[PDB]
Design a protein around this ligand. Structure first.
Ligand SMILES: CSc1ccccc1CC(=O)N1CCC[C@H](C(F)F)C1
Ligand SMILES: [Zn+2]
Length: 140
């Protein structure tokens, strides 16, 4: 589990969104595994606006933050899980790292701020849903 709290937005994995998220929806995209809902309180996270390929992510199944090198956001085939059939997921970045289903939502960050959240795992790889192109998270 986990979310990004930027401005009056909450960014979560679409497959982990709650009824309150769906009832206060701002934007969602199944192909990216992302959903954004509105919040009453202002958050403290800042979004990175960059092309970094190194950063640090939080892994809840190890209680640890790990430094990683990751690929550029791309269209990657992801195997079937209990939330999605096997399909192409867009705006996804891969790294070598420990992941398990409950690790989704952990933040990946670079020197500029939050880059994305854990969305996929298995086989000693971790995949992150990028958020750096969502410029509207910084306003309104
Ligand atoms: C932490 S992810 C993990 C870890 C070990 C093994 C498998 C997974 C789950 C995983 O890859 N998916 C199921 C949930 C949706 C994900 C993506 F489609 F958005 C795909
Ligand atoms: Zn960066």
């Amino acid at each position: 589990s986990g979310a990004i709290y930027v401005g009056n937005y909450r960014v979560v994995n679409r497959h982990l969104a709650t009824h309150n998220d769906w009832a206060n929806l701002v934007w969602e995209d199944s192909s990216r595994d992302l959903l954004v809902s509105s919040t009453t309180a202002q958050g403290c996270d800042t979004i990175a606006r960059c092309d970094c390929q190194t950063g640090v992510y939080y892994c809840s199944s190890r209680r640890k933050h790990y430094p990683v090198s990751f690929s550029k956001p791309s269209l990657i085939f992801v195997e079937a899980s209990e939330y999605y059939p096997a399909r192409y997921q867009s705006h996804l970045m891969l790294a070598v790292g420990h992941s398990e289903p409950g690790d989704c939502g952990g933040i990946l960050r670079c020197q500029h701020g939050v880059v994305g959240i854990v969305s996929t795992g298995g086989n000693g790889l971790v995949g992150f849903a990028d958020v750096r192109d969502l410029l509207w998270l910084d306003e309104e």
